[PDB]
Design an enzyme around this catalytic site. Structure first.
Site, PDB file in Angstrom:
ATOM      1  N   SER A 196       5.725  -3.450   0.303  1.00 60.48           N
ATOM      2  CA  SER A 196       7.149  -3.074   1.002  1.00 60.48           C
ATOM      3  C   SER A 196       8.073  -3.312   0.094  1.00 60.48           C
ATOM      4  CB  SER A 196       7.240  -4.240   2.254  1.00 60.48           C
ATOM      5  OG  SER A 196       8.180  -4.202   2.997  1.00 60.48           O
ATOM      6  N   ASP A 204       2.562   5.348   7.757  1.00 57.68           N
ATOM      7  CA  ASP A 204       3.415   4.357   7.565  1.00 57.68           C
ATOM      8  C   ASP A 204       4.746   4.450   8.347  1.00 57.68           C
ATOM      9  OD1 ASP A 204       5.284   2.307   6.753  1.00 57.68           O
ATOM     10  OD2 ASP A 204       4.452   2.078   4.634  1.00 57.68           O
ATOM     11  N   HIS A 247       1.295   0.988   7.140  1.00 55.94           N
ATOM     12  CA  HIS A 247       2.122  -0.077   6.356  1.00 55.94           C
ATOM     13  C   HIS A 247       1.281  -1.301   5.795  1.00 55.94           C
ATOM     14  CE1 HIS A 247       5.867  -1.110   4.192  1.00 55.94           C
ATOM     15  NE2 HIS A 247       5.629  -2.751   4.825  1.00 55.94           N
TER      16      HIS A 247
END
Ligand code: CL
Ligand code: CL
Length: 257
Positions: A130, A175, A207
Site C-alpha cells: 500500500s 484493487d 488490495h
C-alpha cells in the site's frame, strides 16, 4: 562467477514456497529504536554466507505481522529482511519512507551481532504494501544507492518518482483501495524510461492480496531481489518472455533481459 550467488538453480515451483535456508527471527521492540516502530528481522541461519538486506513496510493501518509470510519467504531464499512496524499505524507514505530509511540504517549499524554477521550492507533493497509501497517509491528516489524496490499494491498521491533504482510493481486488478489506473500504472509509467522497470497485474486480486501467501508475489519479488541485490542472472528467466496466467497485465522496458 558472481560472488553473490546463493542457493540452487531456481525452478518456478521452488519460488512459491520457503527456500533452502533455515530462518531465524529477532523481535525489534518499538521502544528500542528511534525513527521507526521496531518490527521483526527474518534472516538466514545455519550458514556462513552473507546476504543482501531488505527493509519492508506494511500498509495502511497495518502491523508487520501482515507481511510475516513474505518476510520469512524472502529470508528463506537468502536475504536479511526487516519488516517494520510504523511509529503510528496511521502514518502516510512519505513518513513510511523515512522509517524505511531509519530501519536500513538500524540493520547496518545497530541490529544484533548474529544478524550483522549474515548481512552484506553494501547490497540493500526495499519493498512495501500500500502506503508502504508509496514509501518504497519515495525512498528509491531519495536514496539511489538501493539495489531494488518492489511496491506491492502501492498507494501515493505523488505519481512521479525520478529514480534509477530498478522497480517492480505488483498491481491488483480488482484493487479498490489503490485502483491501479490511479496508482500502480501511473507510477510505472512515470518512472524514468532508462530505469529497468516491470509492472505485473494479478488477475482478480484486491488490495489484501499481499497479506497472505501468494504464489505470484513470491515468484516476482524473489526474482527481482535476486536479480538486482545478488546480480543473479539465473532469475531473469522468470522476468523475461513472461506468459503467466496469474497476470492480467504485464509491462516492461525490457532493460533487465
Ligand atoms: Cl506522510
Ligand atoms: Cl549509509
Amino acid at each position: 562467477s558472481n560472488p553473490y550467488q546463493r542457493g540452487p538453480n531456481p525452478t518456478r515451483s521452488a519460488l512459491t514456497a520457503d527456500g533452502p535456508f533455515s530462518v531465524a527471527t529477532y523481535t525489534v521492540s518499538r521502544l528500542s529504536v528511534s525513527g521507526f516502530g521496531g518490527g521483526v528481522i527474518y534472516y538466514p541461519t545455519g550458514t556462513s554466507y552473507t546476504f543482501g538486506g531488505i527493509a519492508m513496510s506494511p500498509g495502511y493501518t497495518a502491523d508487520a505481522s501482515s507481511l510475516a509470510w513474505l518476510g520469512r519467504r524472502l529470508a528463506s531464499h537468502g536475504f536479511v529482511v526487516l519488516v517494520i512496524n510504523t511509529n503510528s499505524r496511521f502514518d502516510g507514505p512519505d513518513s513510511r519512507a523515512s522509517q524505511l530509511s531509519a530501519a536500513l540504517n538500524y540493520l547496518r549499524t545497530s541490529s544484533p551481532s548474529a544478524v550483522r554477521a549474515r548481512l552484506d550492507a553494501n547490497r540493500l533493497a526495499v519493498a512495501g504494501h500500500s502506503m508502504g509501497g508509496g514509501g518504497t517509491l519515495r525512498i528509491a528516489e531519495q536514496n539511489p544507492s538501493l539495489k531494488a524496490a518492489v511496491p506491492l499494491t502501492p498507494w501515493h498521491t505523488d505519481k512521479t518518482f525520478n529514480t534509477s533504482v530498478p522497480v517492480l510493481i505488483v498491481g491488483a486488478e480488482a484493487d479498490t483501495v489503490a485502483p491501479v489506473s490511479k496508482h500502480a500504472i501511473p507510477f510505472y509509467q512515470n518512472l524514468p524510461s532508462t530505469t529497468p522497470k516491470v509492472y505485473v497485474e494479478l488477475c482478480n486480486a484486491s488490495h489484501i492480496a499481499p497479506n497472505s501467501n501468494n504464489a505470484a508475489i513470491s515468484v516476482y519479488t524473489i526474482s527481482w531481489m535476486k536479480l538486482w541485490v545478488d546480480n543473479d542472472t539465473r532469475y531473469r528467466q522468470f522476468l523475461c518472455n513472461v506468459n503467466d496466467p496469474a497476470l492480467c497485465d504485464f509491462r516492461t522496458n525490457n532493460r533487465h533481459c
